[PDB]
C-alpha cells in the first residue's frame, strides 16, 4: 500500500499531474532517477545553471531520464558532430505528455506565430532564456526546464526570423545568433557532448535581433533527453 520510488521522484510525479503514483509514474514509461548533489554529473549541471544567468535560479533536485527507445530513434544522430547539452523550458503541465511521448514538432497547418525559426524543437545555451518559458509566479514559484543531447551537426546561423521550410544542403540544424553567448573558451565535454557552460558575454554579434542563442532542430529523433531538473525561482 505504498510507493517503491524515492521521495523527491514522487514530489515530482505529484506535480506534473497536479491516480496511484506508481500508475502515473508508468504511464510516463521514462526511468527517473535522481543524480547524486555531490557527484561530478551535478556539479557540472549546477555550475551550467549558475554561468548562464545574465529570477535567480535554485537547483532543488536534478533526474537522470530515459524514455523508451529514444535511445533507437536517436541512434542514427549520435554519429552526428555538434553535440550539445541544451535547455528545453515548459509550463508544468506540459511535462506529462513530453516524458509520455517526447518533444515533437507542431504541425504547418496549426496556425502559429512568434516562431522566428519556423516549427521545430528549440532550445537555449543560457538557463535564464529556457526558464522563461516555465512561466513560474511568486504563488507557485518551482518550474521544470529539460537538458537534451541536441545533434546540431553543421548549423546554419541566422540572426533574424525566418520561417524555415527545408535547411541548405548539408545544414542539419539552424542557430540563431543572440546578442549574449556562453565564453566559448569555457566549454567542456560531458559524455563526449560540448557544455557550454562559460559565463554569458557579448558575443560581438552585432546587427542582431536575439538576446540569446536560439536552436532549432526539425527532426524528434536529433533530441536525446538527458536530465529534468526542478528549480526554485527566487523573486
Ligand atoms: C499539444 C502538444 O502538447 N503538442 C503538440 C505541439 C508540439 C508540442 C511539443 O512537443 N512542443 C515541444 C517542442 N516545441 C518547441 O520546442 C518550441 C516551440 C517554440 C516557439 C517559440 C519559442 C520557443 C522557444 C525558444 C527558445 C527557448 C525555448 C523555447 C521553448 N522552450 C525553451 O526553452 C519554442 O520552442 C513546441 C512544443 C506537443
Redesign the pocket.
Given at each position: 500500500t505504498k510507493s517503491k520510488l524515492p521521495k523527491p521522484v514522487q514530489d515530482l510525479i505529484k506535480m506534473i499531474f497536479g491516480d496511484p503514483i506508481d500508475v502515473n509514474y508508468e504511464k510516463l514509461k521514462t526511468d527517473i532517477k535522481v543524480v547524486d548533489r555531490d557527484s561530478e554529473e551535478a556539479e557540472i549541471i549546477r555550475k551550467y545553471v549558475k554561468n548562464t544567468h545574465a529570477h535567480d535560479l535554485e537547483v532543488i533536485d536534478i533526474f537522470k531520464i530515459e524514455r523508451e527507445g529514444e535511445c533507437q530513434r536517436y541512434k542514427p544522430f549520435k554519429q552526428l558532430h555538434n553535440r550539445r547539452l541544451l535547455?528545453?523550458?515548459?509550463r508544468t503541465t506540459?511535462f506529462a505528455?513530453?516524458l509520455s511521448?517526447?518533444?515533437?514538432?507542431?504541425?504547418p497547418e496549426?496556425p502559429?506565430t512568434?516562431?522566428?525559426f519556423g516549427?521545430?524543437?528549440?532550445?537555449?545555451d543560457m538557463v535564464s532564456?529556457?526558464?522563461?518559458?516555465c512561466h513560474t509566479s511568486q504563488g507557485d514559484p518551482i518550474g521544470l526546464?529539460?537538458l537534451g543531447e541536441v545533434a546540431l551537426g553543421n548549423m546554419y546561423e541566422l540572426k533574424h526570423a525566418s520561417h524555415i521550410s527545408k535547411l541548405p544542403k548539408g545544414k542539419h540544424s539552424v542557430k540563431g545568433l543572440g546578442k549574449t553567448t556562453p565564453d566559448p573558451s569555457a566549454n567542456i565535454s560531458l559524455d563526449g557532448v560540448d557544455v557550454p557552460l562559460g559565463t554569458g558575454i557579448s558575443s560581438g554579434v552585432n546587427d542582431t535581433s536575439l538576446l540569446?542563442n536560439?536552436y532549432?532542430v526539425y527532426d524528434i529523433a536529433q533530441v536525446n533527453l538527458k536530465y529534468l531538473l526542478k528549480l526554485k525561482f527566487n523573486f
Open positions: 535547455w528545453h523550458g515548459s506540459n505528455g513530453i511521448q517526447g518533444l515533437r514538432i507542431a504541425p496549426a502559429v512568434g516562431y522566428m516549427k521545430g524543437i528549440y532550445f537555449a532564456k529556457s526558464a522563461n518559458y526546464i529539460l540569446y536560439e532549432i
